[PDB]
Amino acid sequence: MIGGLFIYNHKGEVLISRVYRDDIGRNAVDAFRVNVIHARQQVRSPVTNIARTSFFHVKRSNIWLAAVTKQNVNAAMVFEFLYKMCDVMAAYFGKISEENIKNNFVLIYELLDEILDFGYPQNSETGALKTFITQQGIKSQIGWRREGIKYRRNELFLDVLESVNLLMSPQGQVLSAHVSGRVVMKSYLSGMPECKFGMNDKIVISIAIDDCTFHQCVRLSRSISFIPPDGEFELMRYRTTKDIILPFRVIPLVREVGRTKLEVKVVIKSNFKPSLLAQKIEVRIPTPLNTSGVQVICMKGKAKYKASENAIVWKIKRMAGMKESQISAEIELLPTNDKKKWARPPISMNFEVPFAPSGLKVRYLKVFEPKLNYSDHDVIKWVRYIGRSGIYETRC
């Protein structure tokens, strides 16, 4: 019925676990870590099915709770049970955070025993668990905007401007990757309005460390409440390191037969929807310095040589998604030095895409002006995501 219960922290490591039916192995926990939490573009759903198994998961402010089962279990029962459990946890030690869990391991096992038997959620009213639980948890604990602004036509525009940074190893292992971005908001409003703005959970509130700084106006309580200043400004800056959605994947192939011939093929794959369009792509391929000449062949965009710059350049006017393109090149080397083993530098790429590589998506926006009349229904809003290549390199 209830195959096995698990509690994870936001990093994705098992804070605690307890299984109930041997038909659930290590593969289960690994699958729920690599197929739901670390899922990238999948449309989320509080009930998911993989490899003939089903998962239910509830999010509590940073903590994932999940139940896994293979039977045709009564669905509503799962979620009512999870809510009862989160409530009992609260009643024993207040809010739910990593600290309380790591500090009441014993109580958590006591619960997962008593409340939940073999998968059959026996009585769980907190007033009555004193009978069976004997432990005890441990609790712990304007000026920027003129008033008198008049416009004839309400408008606003949100731009999620992000920059992605990537450095990958020839066998396709993602070595380094992080996205730094900011939410620039340009408005045109009449009066002193309130605004409520909410988004998804991909942004928590020479080494990339996650971060999220606001503007002085922002106010928290999840969501965002604020009174925008007139004109253009910056709402929040942030930096993320996980679950990134690498637009292009570059695969290199290099064969250095002899010390005079050197052949290099590159193939780029688009890893996103087939209707979008990445624009203005550039690939910079390196070459050893004692390189006499080059032969290049490509059926997408156009490439040429830059001897002074010491690189081959390959431009792409536009490109779709889920497709594959390829450039070939042969290289004759001037055998001057019988030395100096060429430590080839990485292959770089520049590109612009109309979707936030970090996975951010503007969930919802309400604009409410009290003293005057209008509301969200009466203001025109535009949204634009712009993700740009930062340092985007592939070891070849």
Binding site: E99, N103, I138, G172, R255, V257, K265, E324
Partner: protein, 600 residues
Amino acid sequence: GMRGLAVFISDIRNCKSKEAEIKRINKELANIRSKFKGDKALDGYSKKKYVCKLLFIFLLGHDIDFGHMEAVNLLSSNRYTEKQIGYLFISVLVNSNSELIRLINNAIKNDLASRNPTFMGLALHCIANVGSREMAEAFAGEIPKILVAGDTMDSVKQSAALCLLRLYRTSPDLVPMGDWTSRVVHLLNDQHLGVVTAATSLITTLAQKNPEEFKTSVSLAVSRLSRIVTSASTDLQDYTYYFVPAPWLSVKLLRLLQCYPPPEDPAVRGRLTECLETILNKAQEPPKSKKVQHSNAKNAVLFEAISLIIHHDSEPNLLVRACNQLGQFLQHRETNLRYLALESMCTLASSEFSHEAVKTHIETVINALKTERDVSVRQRAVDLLYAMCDRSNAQQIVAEMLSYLETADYSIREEIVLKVAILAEKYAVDYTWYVDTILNLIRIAGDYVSEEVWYRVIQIVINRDDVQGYAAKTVFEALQAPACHENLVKVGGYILGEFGNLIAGDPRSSPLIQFNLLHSKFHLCSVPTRALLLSTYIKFVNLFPEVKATIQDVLRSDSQLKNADVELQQRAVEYLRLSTVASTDILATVLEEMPPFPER
């Protein structure tokens, strides 16, 4: 040593919660803040213990914003424990209080002026650990002078050379290339091997930008290496690791040689070659231990040596001996060893001299590939397979690659199919080989094959055809297994709709059952596949009128002409109106044999 520290750490380890721990730490911090701000002067012992507690707290993860004053006061003491704790603290917590920087420069100047090599050791260690530009300006003028003076004790010489290295990496401008070159390179003949260790590392990192100033190092390098390798078992007893004579010194010495061309002195060159050959020979005897340590230690030197030979690339006999040893490695327990051998063969495959040598071990390579359990190992092996495929062995390599695809796991399919496609396009000696390989690849793992690949195979079939029965039967059979997937449906549908006159003879290849295959694949394929199928349908209707009714019976379904998509129903209407009406003979002038594809 210090009981208070122990009880402190024990109480910390008995905290039941992060809040209780952080409270206790704030408490101890308040206490030590007070006693440091207390007007009472302090005893050296207490100051030592208190800075110890501070360092511990900092190491657990919190913040500490004081104490460095006592850290300064603790350098002028003369008990070793105090000097140790003080220099440790000052090294761990980096801060830019200019006054404290000056004080520390003063204290370290004093210590280096002293004569106890222990104090000199601590001073050099601290300088090497922090290494600020200011400590540079304060000691980079002196350090080589400490290194070259004859009476300086051993450990002093070691640590001083290493600190000169640290200086060189941090601040290159503040170490002038003066006279000490001769004596620093002469360091190598010392009996204390550790001196040689330090001197070698330093000389490597220096010569990486001024070779012509250190060229005189290679002679001593090769002499020491020879004396090490031809050594006896009970030589260098303090410097021998599990019956292996001086590994690390050999590693670093070979590394030093790697920064230089081949030696220019003939006798030097010859002794060097003899050393290398000695290493390789020693690599072939049975082990003197059942313990992994001996294997790792010896193979370290072995890999270093072969990498050096590659950097030289002038000893063909040595190259091929190396390759043969490597090939012997490929079937080994130590996954480390297998990975490393693969990695090194990857670069050896680039030689004018060891190419065929690498080629010969191909069956070992493929057998390792066909059963290996790691993913990185398999990736490296496939890449090697790529690296040694040429006019000679391409056919067998490709065949084995496909035969592996026949079962290989998901984690490799993408690059395997990419590389097989590229090899096919590169060395296909004839059409029929090319088409055979491509079609098999598609049948096996189409859903990764590029868009251009099967464009090309259909194009080439259109041009130099003579494979029509083969292609037709292949797609025919691959279809009736219930697994056939898209790109196969596309390519086969098109090609048999073009050339089914050459397969319709088999009683199990009827036009009727051909359509039954294609329709059985219809209700699972997407819309462009469906469009291709509908074009092949009318091509058939032109050729084999024997299902001319039932095909139309399908074309009239609610599923066809009421089609949600536009282009499906567009083609459906056009074809139904072509067939049932509006002609029955001009069909032969519209559905002709698709004039051959022009040469781009």
